[PDB]
Amino acid sequence: NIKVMCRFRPLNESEVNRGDKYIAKFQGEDTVVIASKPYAFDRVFQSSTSQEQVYNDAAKKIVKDVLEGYNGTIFAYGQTSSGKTHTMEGKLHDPEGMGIIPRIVQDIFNYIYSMDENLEFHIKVSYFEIYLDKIRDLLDVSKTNLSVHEDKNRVPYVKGATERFVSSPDEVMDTIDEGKSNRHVASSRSHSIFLINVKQENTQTEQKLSGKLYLVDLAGSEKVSKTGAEGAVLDEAKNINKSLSALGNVISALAEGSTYVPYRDSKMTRILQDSLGGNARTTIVICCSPSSYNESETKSTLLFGQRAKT
Amino acid sequence: MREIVHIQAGQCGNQIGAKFWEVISDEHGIDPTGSYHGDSDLQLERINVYYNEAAGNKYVPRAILVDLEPGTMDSVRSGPFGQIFRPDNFVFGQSGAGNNWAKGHYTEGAELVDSVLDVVRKESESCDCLQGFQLTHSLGGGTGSGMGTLLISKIREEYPDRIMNTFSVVPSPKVSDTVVEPYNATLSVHQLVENTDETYCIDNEALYDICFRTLKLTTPTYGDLNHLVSATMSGVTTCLRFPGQLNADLRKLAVNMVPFPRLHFFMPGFAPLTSRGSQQYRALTVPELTQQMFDAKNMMAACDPRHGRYLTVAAVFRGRMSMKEVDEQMLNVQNKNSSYFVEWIPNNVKTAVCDIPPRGLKMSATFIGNSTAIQELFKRISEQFTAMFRRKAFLHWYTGEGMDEMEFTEAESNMNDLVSEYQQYQ
Amino acid sequence: MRECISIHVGQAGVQIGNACWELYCLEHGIQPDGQMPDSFNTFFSETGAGKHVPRAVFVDLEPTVIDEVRTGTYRQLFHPEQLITGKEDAANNYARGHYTIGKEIIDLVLDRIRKLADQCTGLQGFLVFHSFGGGTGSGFTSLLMERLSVDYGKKSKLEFSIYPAPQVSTAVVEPYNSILTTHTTLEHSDCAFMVDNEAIYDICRRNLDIERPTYTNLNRLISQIVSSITASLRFDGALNVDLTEFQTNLVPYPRIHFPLATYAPVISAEKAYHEQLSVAEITNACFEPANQMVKCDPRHGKYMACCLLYRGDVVPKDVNAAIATIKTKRSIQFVDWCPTGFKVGINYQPPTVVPGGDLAKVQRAVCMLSNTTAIAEAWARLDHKFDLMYAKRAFVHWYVGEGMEEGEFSEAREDMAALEKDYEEVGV
């Protein structure tokens, strides 16, 4: 099933002199109180907890299940200066407090190097964005209007995705950097999807198992009435908010045990039609700055988590 | 302001939109020469929304005509109100799709759509600020369905921020005019679901029965069916063309009937429809029109509304009415049939009123119901599709022209998920 | 010296403006073309010699309603600058009329209001007519209240807003926009007069004896209400009630400023002869649950304050006698902490009658504005509708696709809940 796990980052010295207050109150270990109202979650990780425990509690079971042929998915989300870059990648090479994605990649490459020699663990990776409802590709400048198609087993996928093999964590990091070089950023203004496909082939039993695992770096829900944007930024905000509310509706349909789940309302929910439905664990990680100066927007972020469980 | 360009493809679409230009020109006093000879200034108050002013006070349509056979172009030129159209908007090929979606979506359509696309660019740049388009096609054949589908896809790629219309005539199972109706219809619906913004699922057998029984006419020709469709079409956009006590343009009807992006397939209807003899034994009043349009036997879609629930229903009246009477009767209908009208959407009724009725009647109305009975349509066709797809019948035509079996499978999957959408809200 | 600007938003506001300015031009004797063959300054300027332009600004995005006035009989009274016109309507959407389409038009109307307020010297307050159901009248009015409160702030901003009914309602997506714009209805406005359509339908059916009433009669009645409010400014009475004194005597707490109105006597001409419309009868009829402007029985609520704006041939003695009769009646029960909840207002000018109108020529009149808790019931059922819309997410993606967010829905619902809580607290 789905499990939301919120994070509140530490305060930074840039606003300690500003005179901001720590307005994030706690109750138990899975409920926050903001503006004298409680918002429930499953886990509320604090400024003091490092990346290690957050990783072990959020992403470990997903990787444990996807290596057994199942499918997993992760949703990153947050506004600017909320802790996304710190939580997802953070440190690049430091094994102390680096992000989540490098830890997933290294755990994959450390599990592969502990198995039997009769198992060819092919590791494909894709990295593509969703911009103005168009599925661009960040590994190719020509494939800017890709589309989605299905297969015989009703498993959607992008047709024409610039797949790329890998054989070490450094290649994965280089691919992620090359893709992020072309990412539309002013501040993320586009959803990004990093797919990891682990095809384990058993020779003695002759069975294959392809485990798919999605790292979704979402964009920021932006009340454009306040920001005063005009032009392309406005349309970007429109499409981003559409995709986010569609994803929220889908996750609510999932967690409410609804007989039907409208996956086809948005492309980001169309591509993920399989990795969320049944035998597929999923964990939503939201990063937030608990400073009062960023209180208002933070509420929206917390509400995006509240459209997961209830 | 809020201009509209009327794309119009296929033989059936050509005839329907021709009758539409006929009825809309009769209401604006536009002679066959494109010249104005009307009476009221309210006609010319909003002539620019469809028509365009030319040298000599000659108003010409903003209508693109499309086909892969010049016979329909000959018909539209030679028929009445043919000279009104602009000759440059005639865009015709020579092959003919032959009820092949592939030919009219990959081979001939892809080669011909550049002219149509440049022409709609020209017509969209000549205006001030348009609101939405109108596609008038048919899901049975390959010319209409395939060409309009490729075209509307290119449009939504170009203009994704404009409301979109599709006045489709879905093929009924009993009125079997061609053999590959399920293929073309499903392959078109795979694109109309994700590209369009609101679609009106007119049906042939519906209008046939309406002309047999509700009008008691003995020989229903395509002219009468097209006249029904034309009255339906003009009834929807009267709010733009004329003032009123409560206006409702296209976008308002959309956002007051489209709760979710995919639940936008509507069954339309029209009232008052009367025979010749019963025209005297009929008092034109709001309760009469009201109980006449909600009748299942006054619908232009072959799907019994009694077998399903209403989600949203827009009644666009036309005439100097009393709004209290209107809202009272619509409320009373929502109360008498509380089981049909859905419960988790209070005020299932949208209402719209104008002051200028059609030329001939004292009052009139128009009906757009977003019922859940539509699933039955997409059930029946689907069965036929399976019956033709299980044995791979008639498939080598589509295969040899550029398609693949997986596109058929994807269309079927999307259509079944749409049926599930319409099921769960029942 | 005195003055009051009148903003008119949406088709509802513009048609109410047609009716109102018809009433105004009739009362002061001014022809449709502005030519008048002192007192008009409260609503009319003076364009030098032989002209009187109004202190109004019609704003709307549907060009049809505004072009109906540019071509109507009052094409000469207004001039093309006050008749602002957009290109694409909000289409029953808060978000389109709030930021997407609103930003194209609001600079011009704000420039015009700056040019129109610098013309006067004793501005008393604004008047913003809008329906809570439409997209324009909600979003554009929210934006406009924000901009004015940032600019002016202190001036008494009033809004005589139409309210969607629970049963007799025209659009599907009205509860959304209503809840969304209640935020600005609270924070920026100063005293809003909610009005429902079904109440006016019932009043026209019962008293006026019209079986088929359209919106013109509703608008005439609301124009009579506004004239009853503003005759204390226009003409000179024996006991004047300015808008600031009105608000002071009627708005106890800063959040409780939504008094429902009611007007009397509303009766046809044939019924006028039989009934002797004395002060006591018209004063008693206003307290009846059937003659109010909104669907809510006052018997389950408790009045906190109410202003009686009598106009015409009235003397204070029978007024005080009828007031004593009301205070003796137990069914009309008042709240304990306000022993005197009346602010009487007399004025010499009787109410006029428009040619072709449904009302009769009377000599006495009343416009009671009861600030009660019973109005909250409407919000409750409105919230109920909103809940039935909200849990299933009907029509959300349309608003989301123009900038709006789920958090705004949640915050607006929480705020309406807190407001109903406040009314329920102050009742005891």
Ligand SMILES: Nc1nc2c(ncn2[C@@H]2O[C@H](COP(=O)(O)CP(=O)(O)OP(=O)(O)O)[C@@H](O)[C@H]2O)c(=O)[nH]1
């Ligand atoms: N309601 C109407 N249906 C019509 C009319 N004329 C033809 N048709 C029906 O439309 C269906 C076929 O559509 P078309 O005649 O336009 C053939 P299409 O243009 O789609 O491509 P081709 O087969 O390549 O010619 C079919 O069911 C006809 O019976 C009409 O005037 N009204």
Ligand SMILES: Nc1nc2c(ncn2[C@@H]2O[C@H](COP(=O)(O)OP(=O)(O)OP(=O)(O)O)[C@@H](O)[C@H]2O)c(=O)[nH]1
């Ligand atoms: N009493 C009265 N109510 C009216 C009148 N006109 C409209 N209403 C109501 O106004 C509500 C709909 O709001 P509209 O004003 O038409 O919409 P809008 O403000 O123009 O915004 P858009 O529709 O997006 O262009 C409905 O509930 C109408 O019943 C009127 O003349 N008198």
Ligand SMILES: [Mg+2]
């Ligand atoms: Mg053809």
Ligand SMILES: [Mg+2]
């Ligand atoms: Mg409007």
